[PDB]
Amino acid sequence: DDKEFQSVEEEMQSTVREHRDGGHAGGIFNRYNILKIQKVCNKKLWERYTHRRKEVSEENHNHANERMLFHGSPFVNAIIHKGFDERHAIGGMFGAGIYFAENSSKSNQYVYGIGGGTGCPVHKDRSCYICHRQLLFCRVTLGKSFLQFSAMKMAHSPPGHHSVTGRPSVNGLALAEYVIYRGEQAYPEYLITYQIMRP
Numbered sequence: 001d002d003k004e005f006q007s008v009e010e011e012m013q014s015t016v017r018e019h020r021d022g023g024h025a026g027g028i029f030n031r032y033n034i035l036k037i038q039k040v041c042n043k044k045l046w047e048r049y050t051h052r053r054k055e056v057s058e059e060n061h062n063h064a065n066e067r068m069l070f071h072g073s074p075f076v077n078a079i080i081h082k083g084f085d086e087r088h089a090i091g092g093m094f095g096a097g098i099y100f101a102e103n104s105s106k107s108n109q110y111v112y113g114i115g116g117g118t119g120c121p122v123h124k125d126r127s128c129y130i131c132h133r134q135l136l137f138c139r140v141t142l143g144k145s146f147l148q149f150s151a152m153k154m155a156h157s158p159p160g161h162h163s164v165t166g167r168p169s170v171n172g173l174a175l176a177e178y179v180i181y182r183g184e185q186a187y188p189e190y191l192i193t194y195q196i197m198r199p
């Protein structure tokens, strides 16, 4: 458990980047105080995930193209019990999808809502150093992933594809993002409780 969770902690800290908004959405910090890392064991969600992963693999030259990615949401507790649900997803960069990041600090910008919302419920602060936040570190099946640079408002995956990869560009994205259009293509494997730390 210790080495498995240290690997999660390393992924969480090492993928932090300096954000263009100067910390507006997610707060100002260089690292986190990781409080707890819990493995989510939801058999029904796991099987919904693996059934779809097998299907996608068969449609993508025997390859699921699975990645471990972060997800930030004010609804992590509904996600761990009921799973990711595309019915809760159009106005986003790549449309009506479920978004993930390979940089934990990008997902951190979504923990209190879009653009950070009004921050924590207690102090109404997007840069709250006191209130404990939660992120998910997820197993995500990308399958055949459609590489895109500019905004493309999809309702579903592009024809013949299983996801969209938003790649960084001068005029566009600062960091990558990964988008699925079917909730069963992600499993909320780790629940991370943490605080952002004052630099």
Ligand SMILES: O=C1N=CCc2c(O)cccc21
Residues within 6 Å of the ligand: 070, 071, 072, 073, 092, 099, 100, 101, 106, 107, 108, 110, 177, 178
């Ligand atoms: O973790 C996320 N949660 C919601 C939206 C989002 C994005 O729109 C891009 C990358 C990551 C996330």
Ligand SMILES: [Zn+2]
Residues within 6 Å of the ligand: 120, 121, 122, 123, 124, 125, 128, 129, 130, 131
């Ligand atoms: Zn607070």
